[PDB]
Amino acid sequence: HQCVKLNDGHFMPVLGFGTYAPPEVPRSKALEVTKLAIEAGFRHIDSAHLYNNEEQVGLAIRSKIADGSVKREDIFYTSKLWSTFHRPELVRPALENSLKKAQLDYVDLYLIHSPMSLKPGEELSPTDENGKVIFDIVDLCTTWEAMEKCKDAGLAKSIGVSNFNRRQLEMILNKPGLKYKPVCNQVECHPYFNRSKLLDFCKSKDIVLVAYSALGSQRDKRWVDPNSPVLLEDPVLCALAKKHKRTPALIALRYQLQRGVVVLAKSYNEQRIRQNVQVFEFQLTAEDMKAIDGLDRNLHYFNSDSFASHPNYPYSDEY
Ligand SMILES: NC(=O)c1ccc[n+]([C@@H]2O[C@H](COP(=O)([O-])OP(=O)(O)OC[C@H]3O[C@@H](n4cnc5c(N)ncnc54)[C@H](OP(=O)(O)O)[C@@H]3O)[C@@H](O)[C@H]2O)c1
Ligand SMILES: CCOc1ccc2c(c1)C[C@H](C(=O)N(C)Cc1cc(C(=O)O)c(C)o1)CO2
Questions:
Q1: Which domains are delineated in the chain?
Q2: Residue 51 among the catalytic residues
Q3: What single string gives the DSSP state of each residue in 119-163?
Q4: Is ligand 2 within 6 A of the CB of residue 135?
């Protein structure tokens, strides 16, 4: 196992456990599989208000601390501010609510989940009389200032963003009176959308790029086009898996580790959870890495097409 030093001095494990499951999956499963992830050796756990599972992920962490399996300081726990809470006065209460649900005193990392602000309220997806999601206009620099106060108050050890493009990152980085840079930008990133340009920008600013959907997403019909290619069926990934006597998933994860990306992996399957930790057991050659670099096709599993008219839609730019 390994960590990366963040630009605020804290350390983030380079392999993280993804916890999202669709609402049809019983919440008891998130409890069970987070315990299995910790037993397998995951120390970085990625949750969010949106996932409706912080209560269970927190219970799993509590249970493994009481086991003597880990200490709280050994676990890197991420939560995320949902887009209906971007107005600055709502940020600290949202974080406090997440902490209360997880029964934790602090999160290791708090992220702005998305730059696309939504109408404030308890509903996650507020909609108007014609069924359209109601956007909000919020200066994300004021949201960031509220995030900074959460770090000063000790409720988040580190703060970062998610789904930001380069221009959106620069707006934070160029903010007058900035106190804390975002430590990371959690974005969709895999061999079919490898974010090389955004990665280079983040590296130049000492911002860690954290990859989600690194195994090609859960392909839920509600949010992912069923005709998109399946990442783990890719011939190059499968040929490399055979060459290294690994699996295409492990190739996809190891690819990110070797280009300096922190990688998340969701699994609710005991054997695949344990398999994913084997990413540390082998290395891709330089030739292998160039072959995978060749797979990019700017394919967004989470394209959020119905939000393409949002002013902060991140894919309005080249990157
Ligand atoms: N910031 C954001 O907006 C955002 C957006 C998307 C995701 N995320 C985070 O990133 C996490 C991961 O992304 P994701 O949920 O899209 O899924 P993912 O990591 O890309 O995984 C996709 C699928 O791969 C399967 N899988 C896992 N290990 C495997 C293996 N060794 N061999 C074959 N298949 C394997 C899993 O199925 P099984 O469960 O059946 O094993 C999973 O459903 C999420 O859970 C969430 O924490 C954040
Ligand atoms: C601010 C943007 O505006 C909105 C408004 C409503 C809305 C969304 C975005 C996105 C939601 C969605 O895509 N869900 C729940 C599937 C999913 C999310 C994640 C994750 O990890 O994040 C994963 C792995 O899957 C749908 O509900």
A1: 3-312 (3.20.20.100)
A2: yes
A3: -SSS-SS-B-TTSPBPB----HHHHHHHHHHHHHTTSEEEEEEES
A4: no
